[PDB]
């Protein structure tokens, strides 16, 4: 229990439950409520609301609260999270692309941001002072993911709709303002063979997922795949463990803080939890109870690696406990359209930015004072967390 | 913010233990790792003999001893909590003792979850490699080659992610592991034949089996039997090939086994610890076969009596058994072959102190000297207690002692076989036939006059200087060799003698006397009008009573006239303050420089610095004492002479290098005393009190056992009682009600009461359920007996407790915040803030004030009380109707466990939202969030250092200091709390408390540090976090860097890495926190090495400056 864990700490000392946190905080998950102030509508160029997709927190020092967001018109807006003022949240706005943005990534430990777009290019931004450092080019189709390794800030990799995977180095020669691929993995996820999500486990190990093949692959970047002359062979390959015979494809990849476990949403509405530090290729836990019908649905982990929050096409965000998959999930109702690219705040356990297709980027915060003193009816709170039954 | 963290008391909780031949191949050793410290002992016949203790630069988490082929003495392997593996070899090069490091290096991995059940470190029985299970799904193997100086470990991936315990099987021709892993099918035991050649696991010698569902550890049986022993909670199993036998002893079902140790080298007998202190013995029957190996017959357990809550068991030589404890004293029991009483074979021999889990702490002074003493709620469970920690070191009603002296009637034994005890009108000689004490007055000494001095002169012929007469009498010759009577025949209040010279001053008459055996000549008869209350002649050193310089005091101002011997002329006039005549004037010499103490009648001491070169009165630093007269005299402790003052607060003036320490010895009241190092009292001087004749580390610890876990403490000066919050644990009875396991301090409480609250009139307890009962004890401050015990409601816990005056009520109140917790509820829903008042021997519940939520913390606030009501900070005003009333609510916290206040600022430490600074607006009447720390820190304790500095304590053994960002703007920029301090303490901080254990008494000596904050930890460590200035902080940072460059750690671990702010999410270098141990270690270094640190930087930057800085800093500690 939560109270007993806190009570016993002074006498017994620190005890390791398995996750980063020293206390079980699954009891307070029902207190998540999003106020009416956090209903930011990402308005388009014409003035009509536009669905935002892809929105992540930052990591620069003294700025671990800014939440970027992108939409279908290429608008990228930085949002303050701790402050409470509707017009004060948008302190930075610009046109990243003219053909939407499909992913975002903050440079670790720095205030630099990269956008993955349908323009078959990826821009490098300095959000500290608005400017375009460079525009990486080389993909033959629309990009779909950008990943930064937290152990190496100057190296990032992208995975496009065309199907090949290229890793860039910002320290390389600028040439004529266009960055060039350092290593390229041609045909990484062949059976429209799009690489749905790319991810960086370590400074060298890279993890990828496919939209059609349905096998997670782990590549090491020490070797050069540009001159492979055949289909590259991954160092490790987590085979598809489900039962459906249809050609499936994963939509999101997520690791914990230690980088051992991997969570991968799939088209079968399951979130398989693999382990990448052992010989057990088979999944450890099977999270289910949502509807992962669309590839846009993404997930994120709690800062203490104790809870997994994922989007769904049933207009709700689901939070399972990472240690007890059998328990019913906590459902964050409040949206009328599907919920995509949910981002739990890594620098604050309280904040959960439930990013949505409803043209409303909601920021959910813990409300332990449920009794409080006023009620404000249902106008004040627009999102209510409830355990699924 | 610049602070100074020093350790007042080293950690005492025992983490692990190991035995072997470390110091040498013949003498047995016992190694104890008390967190950051390592203690090496030698097990002699009489018990442990301390040899060497070294402070490892890390939290020792793995301790193993191995003997590689080709080595004489065993090597030591230590792996810290931050993964700094190292191999240590004892090396006693001559009288000097040092621990060299054969290998070192990190073993941390960038990828990999830190595994559950802690770090497991195992070493092959053949001693060819080291295996560590640091991370889930990995098994680090460190080859033990002589050329592996950097500990080049290699990972080995294994399929079983969750491993409970790993052990190395004995007798295998190849290295073989044996572990109990867990998979959804259930706990299993599977062995692997690891090979260094291929660096990969292979198939195990025997098939994997399905063990009991709660198998917790593995025991590797040695060569004669082989195999592994898998003890769980209910059953004990033995696995070796096809052989498998199991037992189900009911004696172990009560509570789970934790610790184990091998007794016999053959592995026939095994010890087993327990939660409840039980010490089982696991016998292994031997069944010799006709031609095969000696197979086992059956396992058999036995109960060998109850002991301390065991964390390590180590069967030493003979029958003694060391039992280390983390929640109590780590005793050293003895396994008697025959049962003595109650069926217990263990008899405790030498209980070792351990402050243990300091849950709460308070600073008070009982004798009222301004020097507080720590009163900690130490211990837990059955071994909870209440330690009285205080800094610094025979009642027989008799009249005032006019003189005491060692009458060495022995020829040369240097034993006070006789002691001339003198009163105003009587005098009796205390004959001491060894340790005997009897009064037989010697015929050679009179008793009709109040004797003032009875020292020796020469040829072993004593003197006896009485009042109104002087009568030298030889004792051993038993002849009156000299009976020079006093010509003035007045009370000889001053009688100075040393070696073969006596210079007496009969009131106001100095005489130059060459007092020798059979030679008592009155050469001079100088007489002045001014009275001479005190005067003494002392040689400069080895010279036989030769003192070229002398000093004489005055009356109007007591001007210590100093005259140059070659001239007898005026060089520099000296003037001193003080109208009252001094009680005693003493020339003191501990170092090269001399100090002339001036003990006045008011207690003020002016120890002028007398010099053989000059003799001029140095600076007049004043050390105050009580109004009782103070008498100063030299006392014999070591080869170097020392003085021992006597007053209402006796102080041992044990001066260090170029500094005079006035530490208070633990004596109630002393005015007259004589030195004594006899066999009866080797360390206790013959110490007469004001009216009673009595005879006699720096951090003295008293123990008040409670037999239950204390939670919080507080002091009440009005009632002169404490407020301990011990909580008993009693098993539910089979026929209803509860039955206590043992009689605790709560049960044996005179005049105990039971709470009768009717607030909760709205949970089922099984026969085997262990319900906890929480009581509020009241402990007298003098006798420490439990004056009251108010048992609370059923299923009600007590968390917070304060004693403070509320509102306008003059009565001092006892306020306790409780919290009802049912087993099904994750968090308490109903609580109570009940206020008592210890009127006279009883507690009356004045008010109840039912609240909705747990009351995690409480503290007085400007005559009002505020409580943290389960993530809600509420402020209560004490109405004249004697009822708490709500005010100043604040719903912006998540489990606001910790509250601290200073003025109108509240520091509400949260559970994971770091520290929040609240402010009470008087005229508004509402709380205001002035500032809030934003990065999550998982707080464990908080403290308000100053109006801006806010100390914190992360649960990851990391200290940090917040500070209000003044240089900003109000709108969201002044609300930012910016972290300044970062420091890896290495201990879990439980409580913070102001005050210091060192006396001040208005000692305005320009203290470099400001304030003092003592903290207690789980391991029993007590720190003294202070505040430094900018210049001193920079100087100490430079000193720390230079010492790190010079001082070599025992484990080759960098200090900057050890002190870095380590967390699973971030790792920052230490900032704004000067380590105290490292700076204080500068004193112990040799002069040629200290010159290396000193060279090339203040202005001169020479070793005297740095030495005086470090000596001034170490005084607070």
Sign of CA dihedral B449, B452, B453, B454: positive
CATH class of B392-698: mainly beta
Contact state of B111 with A347 under an 8 Å Cβ cutoff: no
Q: How many CB contacts within 8 angstroms connect chain A with chain B?
A: 145
Six token digits for residue B909: 């430490």
∠ CA A189-A52-A163 to the nearest 5 degrees? 15
Task: Give the DSSP letter of residue B967.
Answer: S
Mutate to test the interface with A, among B822, B826, B974 (most CBs of A within 10 A): B826
Contact state of B357 with A10 under an 8 Å Cβ cutoff: yes
Contact state of B934 with A82 under an 8 Å Cβ cutoff: yes
The C-alpha of B853 sits at a distance from chain A's nearest C-alpha, in angstroms, of 11
- What φ, ψ does residue B378 adopt, rounded to 5°? -75, 170
Mutate to test the interface with A, among B827, B890, B913, B969 (most CBs of A within 10 A): B827
Six token digits for residue B526: 């100088």
The CATH number of the structural domain formed by B14-354 is 2.130.10.10
Which chain B residue lies closest to A16 (C-alpha atoms)? B116
- B304: buried, middle or exposed (CB in 10 Å: 19+, 13-18, 0-12)? buried
User: Directed axis angle between helix B1103-1114 and helix B1030-1046, to 10°?
Assistant: 110
- What's the resolution in A? 3.4
Query: Where do breaks (C to N over 2.5 Å) occur in chain B, by preceding residue number?
Result: 393, 696, 762, 1097
CB B942 within 8 A of CB B961: no
Cα–Cα dist A5/A53, whole Å: 39
- Per the listing, tokens 């202190």 go with B277
CB B109 within 8 A of CB B134: yes
Parts of chain B belonging to CATH 1.10.150.910: 1028-1117
Cα–Cα dist B835/B726, whole Å: 17
Q: How far is CA B735 from CA A111, A153, B730, in A?
A: 68, 68, 14
Contact state of A260 with B136 under an 8 Å Cβ cutoff: yes
Using a CB-CB cut-off of 8 Å, the residues of chain B touching A2 are 826-827
Nearest to A146 by CA among A179, A210, A101: A101
Parts of chain B belonging to CATH 2.130.10.10: 1-13+355-391+699-1027, 14-354, 392-698
CB A154 within 8 A of CB A114: no
CB B130 within 8 A of CB B139: no
Using a CB-CB cut-off of 8 Å, the residues of chain B touching A28 are 894
Using a CB-CB cut-off of 8 Å, the residues of chain B touching A205 are 111
Experimental method: cryo-EM
CB B375 within 8 A of CB B361: yes
Using a CB-CB cut-off of 8 Å, the residues of chain B touching A16 are 114, 116-118
β-strand partners of A312: A339
Contact state of B135 with A366 under an 8 Å Cβ cutoff: no
Contact state of A277 with B118 under an 8 Å Cβ cutoff: no
Which chain B residue lies closest to A83 (C-alpha atoms)? B972
CATH class of B1-13+355-391+699-1027: mainly beta
Beta strand B915-920 with B927-932 is: antiparallel
User: Directed axis angle between helix B1087-1094 and helix B1030-1046, to 10°?
Assistant: 130
Sign of CA dihedral A144, A149, A153, A155: negative
Contact state of A9 with B913 under an 8 Å Cβ cutoff: no
CB B708 within 8 A of CB B745: yes
CATH class of B1028-1117: mainly alpha
Which of A2, A83, A284 lies closest to B827 in CB terms? Answer: A2
User: Directed axis angle between helix B1103-1114 and helix B1087-1094, to 10°?
Assistant: 100
Which chain A residue lies closest to B941 (C-alpha atoms)? A10
Six token digits for residue B1019: 């391991």
Which chain B residue lies closest to A369 (C-alpha atoms)? B891
The C-alpha of B357 sits at a distance from chain A's nearest C-alpha, in angstroms, of 5
Contact state of A17 with B897 under an 8 Å Cβ cutoff: no
CB A214 within 8 A of CB A249: yes
The C-alpha of A378 sits at a distance from chain B's nearest C-alpha, in angstroms, of 19
Q: Please name the residues in contact with B46: beta carbons below 8 A apart, sequence gap of 6 or more.
A: none
Task: Give the DSSP letter of residue A159.
Answer: E
């Amino acid at each position: 229990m939560l109270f007993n864990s806190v009570l016993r700490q002074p006498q017994l000392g620190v005890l390791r439950n398995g996750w980063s946190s020293q206390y079980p905080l699954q009891s307070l998950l029902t207190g998540y409520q999003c106020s009416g102030n956090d209903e930011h509508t990402s308005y388009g160029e014409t003035g009509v609301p536009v669905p935002p997709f892809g929105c992540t927190f930052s990591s620069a020092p003294n700025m671990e609260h800014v939440l970027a967001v992108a939409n279908e018109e290429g608008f990228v807006r930085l949002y303050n999270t701790e402050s409470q003022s509707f017009r004060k949240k948008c302190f930075k706005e610009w046109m990243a692309h003219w053909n939407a943005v499909f992913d975002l990534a903050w440079v670790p430990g720095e205030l630099k941001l990269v956008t993955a777009a349908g323009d078959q290019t990826a821009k490098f931004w300095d959000v500290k002072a608005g400017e375009l450092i460079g525009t990486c080019k080389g993909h033959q189709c629309s990009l779909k993911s950008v990943a930064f390794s937290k152990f190496e800030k100057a190296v990032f990799c992208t995975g496009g709709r065309d199907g090949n995977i290229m890793v860039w180095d910002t320290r390389c020669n600028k040439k004529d303002g266009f960055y060039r691929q350092v290593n390229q993995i041609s045909g990484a996820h062949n059976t429209q063979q799009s690489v749905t999500v790319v991810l960086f486990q370590d400074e060298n190990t890279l993890v990828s997922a496919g939209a059609v093949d349905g096998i997670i692959k782990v590549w090491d970047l020490r070797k050069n795949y540009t001159a492979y002359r055949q289909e590259p062979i991954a160092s490790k390959s987590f085979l598809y463990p489900g039962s459906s015979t249809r050609k499936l494809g994963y939509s999101s990849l997520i690791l914990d803080s230690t980088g051992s476990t991997l969570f991968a949403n799939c088209t079968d509405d399951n979130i398989y939890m693999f382990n990448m530090t052992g010989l057990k290729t088979s999944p450890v836990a099977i999270f289910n109870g949502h509807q992962n019908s669309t590839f846009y649905v993404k997930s994120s982990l709690s800062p203490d690696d104790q809870f997994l929050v994922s989007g769904s096409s049933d207009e709700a965000a689901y939070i399972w406990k990472v240690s007890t998959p059998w328990q019913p999930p906590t459902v964050l109702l409040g949206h009328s359209q599907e919920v995509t690219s949910v981002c739990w705040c890594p620098s604050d356990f309280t904040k959960i930015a439930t990013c949505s297709d409803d043209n409303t980027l909601k920021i959910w915060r813990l409300n332990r004072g449920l009794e409080e003193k006023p009620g404000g009816d249902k106008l004040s709170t627009v999102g209510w967390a409830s355990q699924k039954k | 913010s610049y602070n100074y963290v020093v350790t007042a008391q080293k950690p005492t909780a025992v983490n692990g233990c190991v035995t072997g031949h470390f110091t040498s191949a013949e003498d047995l050793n016992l190694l104890i790792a008390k967190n950051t410290r390592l203690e090496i002992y030698v097990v002699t016949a009489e018990g442990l003999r301390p040899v060497k203790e070294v402070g490892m630069y890390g939290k020792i988490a793995v301790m193993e001893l191995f003997r590689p082929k080709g080595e004489s003495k065993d090597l030591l392997f230590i792996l810290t909590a931050k993964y700094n593996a190292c191999i240590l070899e004892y090396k006693q090069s001559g009288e000097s003792i040092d621990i060299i490091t054969r290998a070192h290096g990190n073993v941390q991995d960038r990828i990999g979850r830190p595994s559950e059940t802690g770090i497991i470190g195992i070493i092959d029985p053949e001693c060819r490699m080291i295996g560590l299970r640091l991370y889930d799904g990995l098994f680090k193997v460190i080859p033990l080659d002589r050329d592996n100086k950097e500990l080049k470990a290699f990972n080995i991936r294994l399929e079983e992610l969750h491993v409970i315990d790993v052990k190395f099987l004995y007798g295998c021709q190849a290295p073989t592991i044996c572990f109990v892993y867990q998979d959804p099918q259930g706990r299993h035991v599977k062995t692997y034949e690891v090979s260094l050649r291929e660096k990969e696991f292979n198939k195990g010698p025997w098939k994997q089996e399905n063990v009991e569902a709660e198998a917790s550890m593995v025991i590797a049986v040695p060569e004669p039997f082989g195999g592994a022993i898998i003890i769980g909670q209910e059953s004990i199993t033995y696995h070796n090939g096809d052989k498998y036998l199991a037992i189900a002893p009911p004696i172990i079902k009560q509570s789970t086994i934790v610790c184990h140790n091998r007794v016999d080298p053959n592995g026939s007998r095994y010890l087993l610890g327990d939660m409840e202190g039980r010490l089982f013995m696991l016998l292994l029957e031997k069944e010799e076969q006709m031609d095969g190996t000696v197979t086992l017959k059956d396992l058999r357990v036995e109960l060998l009596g109850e002991t301390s809550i065991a964390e390590c068991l180590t069967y030493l030589d003979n029958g003694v058994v060391f039992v280390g404890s983390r929640l109590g004293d780590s005793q050293l029991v003895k396994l008697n072959v025959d049962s003595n009483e109650q069926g217990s074979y263990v008899v405790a021999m030498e209980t070792f102190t351990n402050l243990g889990p300091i849950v709460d702490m308070c600073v008070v002074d009982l004798e009222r000297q301004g020097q507080g003493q720590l009163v900690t709620c130490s211990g837990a469970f059955k071994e909870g207690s209440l330690r009285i920690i205080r800094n610094g070191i025979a009642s027989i009603d008799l009249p005032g002692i006019k003189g005491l002296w060692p009458l060495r009637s022995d020829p040369n034994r240097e034993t006070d076989d006789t002691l001339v005890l003198s009163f105003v009108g009587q005098t009796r000689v205390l004959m001491l036939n060894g340790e005997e004490v009897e009064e037989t007055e010697l015929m050679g000494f009179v008793d009709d006059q109040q004797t003032f001095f009875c020292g020796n002169v020469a040829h072993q012929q004593l003197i006896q200087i009485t009042s109104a007469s002087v009568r030298l009498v030889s004792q051993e010759p038993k002849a009156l060799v000299s009976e020079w009577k006093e010509p003035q025949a007045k009370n000889i209040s001053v009688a100075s003698c040393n070696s073969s010279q006596v210079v007496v001053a009969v009131g106001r008459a100095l005489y130059y006397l060459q007092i020798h055996p059979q030679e008592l000549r009155q050469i001079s008869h100088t007489e002045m009008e001014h009275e001479v209350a005190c005067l003494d002649i002392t040689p400069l050193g080895d010279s036989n009573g030769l003192s070229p310089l002398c000093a004489i005091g005055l009356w109007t101002d007591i001007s210590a006239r100093i005259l140059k011997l070659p001239s007898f002329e005026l060089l520099h006039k000296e003037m001193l303050g003080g109208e009252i005549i001094p009680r005693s004037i003493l020339m003191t010499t501990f170092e090269s420089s001399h100090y002339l103490l001036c003990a006045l009648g008011d207690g003020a001491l002016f120890y002028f610095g007398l010099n053989i070169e000059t003799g001029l009165l140095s600076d007049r630093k004043k050390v105050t004492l009580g109004t009782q007269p103070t008498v100063l005299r030299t006392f014999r402790s070591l080869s170097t002479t020392n003085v021992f003052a006597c007053s209402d607060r006796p102080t041992v003036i044990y001066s260090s290098n170029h500094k005079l320490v006035f530490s208070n010895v633990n004596l109630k009241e002393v005015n007259y005393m004589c030195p004594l190092n006899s066999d009866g009292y080797p360390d206790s001087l013959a110490l007469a009190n004001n009216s009673t004749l009595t005879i006699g580390q720096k951090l003295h610890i008293r123990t008040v056992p409670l037999y239950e876990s204390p939670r919080k403490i507080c002091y009440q000066e009005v009632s002169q009682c404490f407020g301990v919050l011990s909580s008993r644990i009693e098993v539910q009875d089979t026929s209803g009600g509860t039955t206590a396991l043992r009689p605790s301090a709560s049960t044996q409480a005179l005049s105990s009461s039971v709470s009768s609250s009717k607030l909760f009139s709205s949970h089922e307890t099984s026969f085997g359920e262990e319900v906890e009962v929480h009581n509020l004890l009241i402990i007298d401050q003098h006798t420490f007996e439990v004056l009251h015990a108010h048992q609370f409601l059923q299923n009600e816990y007590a968390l917070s407790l304060v004693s403070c005056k509320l509102g306008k009520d003059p009565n001092t109140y006892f306020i306790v915040g409780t919290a009802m917790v049912y087993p099904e509820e994750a968090e308490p829903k109903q609580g109570r803030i009940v206020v008592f008042q210890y009127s006279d021997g009883k507690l009356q519940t004045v008010a109840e004030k039912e609240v909705k939520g747990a009351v995690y913390s409480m503290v007085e606030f400007n005559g009002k009380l505020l409580a943290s009501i389960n993530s809600t900070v509420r402020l209560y005003e004490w109405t004249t109707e004697k009822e708490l009333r709500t005010e100043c609510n604040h719903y912006n916290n998540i489990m606001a466990l910790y509250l601290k206040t200073k003025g109108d600022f509240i520091l509400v430490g949260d559970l994971m939202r770091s520290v929040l600074l609240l402010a009470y607006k008087p005229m508004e009447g509402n709380f205001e969030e002035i500032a809030r720390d934003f990065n999550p820190n998982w707080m464990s304790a908080v403290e308000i250092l100053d109006d801006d500095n806010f100390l914190g304590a992360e649960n990851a053994f990391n200290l940090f200091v917040c500070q209000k960002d003044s240089a900003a703007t109000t709108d969201e920029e002044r609300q930012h709390l910016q972290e300044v301090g970062l420091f890896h303490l290495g201990e879990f901080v439980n409580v913070f408390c102001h005050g210091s254990l060192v006396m001040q008494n208005l000692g305005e000596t320009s203290t470099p540090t400001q304030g003092s904050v003592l903290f207690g930890t789980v391991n029993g460590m007590i720190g003294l976090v202070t505040s430094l200035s900018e210049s001193w902080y920079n100087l100490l940072l430079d000193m720390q860097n230079r010492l790190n460059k010079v001082i070599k750690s025992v484990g080759k671990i960098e200090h900057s890495f050890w002190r870095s702010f380590h967390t699973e999410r971030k790792t920052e270098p230490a900032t704004g926190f000067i380590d105290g141990d490292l700076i204080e270690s500068f004193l112990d270094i040799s002069r040629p090495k200290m010159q290396e640190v000193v060279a090339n930087l203040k202005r001169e930057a020479t070793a005297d400056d740095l030495i005086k800085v470090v000596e001034e800093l170490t005084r607070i500690h």
